[PDB]
Design an enzyme around this catalytic site. Structure first.
Site, PDB file in Angstrom:
ATOM      1  N   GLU A  28      21.445  -3.702  25.066  1.00  0.00           N
ATOM      2  CA  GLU A  28      21.620  -3.508  26.556  1.00  0.00           C
ATOM      3  C   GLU A  28      23.064  -3.118  26.792  1.00  0.00           C
ATOM      4  O   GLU A  28      23.601  -3.604  27.796  1.00  0.00           O
ATOM      5  CB  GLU A  28      21.073  -4.696  27.316  1.00  0.00           C
TER       6      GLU A  28
ATOM      7  N   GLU B 122      11.938  -4.513  24.217  1.00  0.00           N
ATOM      8  CA  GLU B 122      11.750  -5.677  25.099  1.00  0.00           C
ATOM      9  C   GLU B 122      10.651  -5.311  26.102  1.00  0.00           C
ATOM     10  O   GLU B 122      10.847  -4.348  26.874  1.00  0.00           O
ATOM     11  CB  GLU B 122      13.138  -6.061  25.697  1.00  0.00           C
TER      12      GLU B 122
HETATM   13  C1  LIG Z   1      16.465  -8.364  27.609  1.00  0.00           C
HETATM   14  C2  LIG Z   1      16.032  -9.497  28.499  1.00  0.00           C
HETATM   15  N1  LIG Z   1      16.371  -9.253  29.941  1.00  0.00           N
HETATM   16  C3  LIG Z   1      16.701 -10.744  27.962  1.00  0.00           C
HETATM   17  C4  LIG Z   1      15.674 -11.911  27.660  1.00  0.00           C
HETATM   18  O1  LIG Z   1      14.670 -11.468  26.763  1.00  0.00           O
HETATM   19  C5  LIG Z   1      17.405 -10.298  26.648  1.00  0.00           C
HETATM   20  O2  LIG Z   1      18.540 -11.028  26.300  1.00  0.00           O
HETATM   21  C6  LIG Z   1      17.770  -8.842  26.988  1.00  0.00           C
HETATM   22  O3  LIG Z   1      18.193  -7.941  25.879  1.00  0.00           O
END
Ligand SMILES: *[C@H]1[C@H]([NH3+])[C@@H](CO)[C@H](O)[C@H]1O
Length: 499
Positions: free
Chosen positions: A173, A292
């Site tokens: 991310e 994800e």
């Molecule tokens: C994607 C999600 N928003 C979070 C929990 O699964 C994870 O740390 C991120 O890369």
């Protein structure tokens, strides 16, 4: 009732399904590790402190690959803090989740766990606070056999044979303002390029996943992917996509349509990859890692009550309902219908955190509603995804127009002589009477018709009681080379054919 038709033609194929589309994800977040896979005080802990009950629940899902250790956590993590003698491992402030991380579990203990559940590990490197030197050293520590400092260090730590990790993630991310060491698309593309090169020089057998957008709504969506691939294309193998969905407005008909957005997101990122392929005059095709995906929204208000700097806080613990399982089923069928370009996908996450498996301290582990469609897709969905021609009735919602009531695909396994039809009926009122033309499959029969249905879309499972569970009483019948099947209102269906 309403009528829908679907052609199942053996010779009209999408692609071989890469089993890695049935992957998952464990991060150092909440109780995923501590209290999830690893609980030394638990009566069912093995010799290494791993919960045997969780091991069995994971093995039944047949998860081939698990991304680790993050996730937002990775962007502030130092891998050396989690290896070697426990007394020398420091306690750290995890800034991603405002927790104290003890590093009692680090990468070598996670590799031991992964071996017990039969999963390979998709290892992520930190490109937030760290860079190319850390990336090459990690790959050397994990993959180089012996005769260098870091390979002999892994041997000294108790792991003679290299882990031989095949697929690696270049950060996590990185487009997000919430990320530790956020980078612009140029900054990211550049450090990902140079990290990818030294990783592959340590071990040219590896594959690399470059970071795409964090969700389709990012202000940098599409622009990000194009810039990052412009900088990395020749050195990487996949680009990632992330997406969570939720029913915050209590609108079931609009909620179940959200897989249409997921479909758009996939086709958009494929287009970008093929843009940059053409720009570079490359012969190589880059594929997608949907590393994800899930439903997430229930835990938002509970999460706000957790004080900072605890160990293993109970974070992001959604309790899933029946409609959540229907959307998960639509998301799985969306991955399968993109088997030509989506080669890895990770249900985020596997245990406690946004998860199909939940645990209690010193207590039981149980299957959420969403466990069942995931299990069915993983166990029954190996082979070739066939190209469907569907005639379905349609509805319009707040956010979507011409939403088919029917979401469906067929998978053909030539080795097993099996055809499996996955189908969701989104209809809130009517049974769908489905007719499937299987003229092209000689001498097949219905093995079974599995159905997941519940009268109450908000019904959850719990440790005590699982009202939402599959039955095998679907009415699918094969005659006159046609499969006829009633798909009840609001249902997930797996129609298995063989012979
Ligand atoms: C994607 C999600 N928003 C979070 C929990 O699964 C994870 O740390 C991120 O890369």
């Amino acid at each position: 009732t309403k009528k829908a038709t679907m052609i199942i033609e053996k010779d009209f194929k999408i692609a071989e399904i890469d089993k890695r589309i049935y992957g998952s994800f464990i991060e150092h977040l909440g109780r995923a590790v501590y209290g999830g896979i690893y609980e030394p005080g638990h009566p069912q802990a093995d010799e290494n402190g791993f919960r045997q009950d969780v091991i069995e629940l994971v093995k039944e899902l047949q998860v081939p690959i698990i991304r680790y250790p993050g996730g937002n956590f990775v962007s502030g993590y130092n891998w050396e803090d989690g290896v070697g003698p426990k007394e020398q491992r420091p306690r750290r402030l995890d800034l991603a989740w405002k927790s104290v991380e003890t590093n009692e579990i680090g990468l070598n203990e996670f590799m031991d766990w992964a071996k017990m559940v039969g999963a390979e590990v998709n290892m992520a490197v930190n490109l937030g606070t760290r860079g190319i030197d850390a990336a090459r050293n990690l790959v050397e520590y994990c993959n180089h056999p012996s005769g260098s400092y870091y390979s002999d260090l892994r041997i000294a730590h108790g792991y003679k044979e290299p882990h031989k990790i095949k697929t690696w993630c270049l950060g996590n991310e990185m487009d997000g303002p919430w990320q530790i060491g956020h980078k612009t698309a140029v900054e990211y593309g550049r450090i990902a390029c140079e990290a990818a090169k030294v990783m592959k020089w340590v071990d040219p057998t590896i594959e690399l996943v470059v970071c795409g957008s964090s969700n389709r709504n990012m202000p940098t969506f599409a622009e990000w992917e194009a810039t990052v691939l412009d900088h990395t294309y020749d050195h990487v193998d996949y680009i990632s996509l992330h997406q969570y969905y939720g029913n915050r407005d209590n609108d079931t008909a609009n909620y179940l349509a959200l897989s249409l957005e997921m479909d758009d997101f996939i086709r958009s990122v494929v287009a970008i990859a093929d843009y940059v392929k053409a720009k570079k005059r490359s012969k190589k095709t880059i594929h997608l890692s949907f590393d994800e995906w899930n439903v997430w929204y229930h835990s938002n208000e509970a999460d706000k009550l957790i004080e900072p700097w605890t160990v293993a806080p109970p974070l992001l613990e959604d309790i899933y309902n029946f409609e959540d399982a229907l959307l998960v089923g639509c998301m799985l069928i969306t991955l399968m219908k993109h088997a030509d370009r989506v080669k890895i996908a990770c249900l985020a996450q596997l245990v406690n955190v946004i998860a199909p498996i939940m645990t209690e301290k010193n207590g039981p582990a149980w299957k959420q509603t969403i466990y069942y469609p995931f299990m069915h897709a993983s166990v029954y969905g190996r082979g070739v995804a066939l190209h469907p021609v569907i005639s379905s009735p349609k509805y319009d919602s707040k956010d979507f127009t011409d939403v088919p009531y029917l979401e469906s695909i067929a998978v053909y396994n030539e080795e097993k002589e099996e055809v499996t039809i996955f189908a969701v009926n989104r209809d809130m009122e009517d049974a769908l009477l489905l007719e499937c033309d299987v003229r092209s499959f000689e001498d097949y029969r219905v093995i079974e018709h599995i159905v997941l249905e519940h009268d109450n879309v908000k019904q959850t499972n719990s440790a005590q009681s699982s009202p939402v569970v599959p039955h095998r009483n679907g009415d699918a019948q094969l005659s006159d080379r046609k499969v006829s099947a009633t798909l009840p209102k609001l249902s997930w269906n797996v129609i298995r054919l063989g012979k």
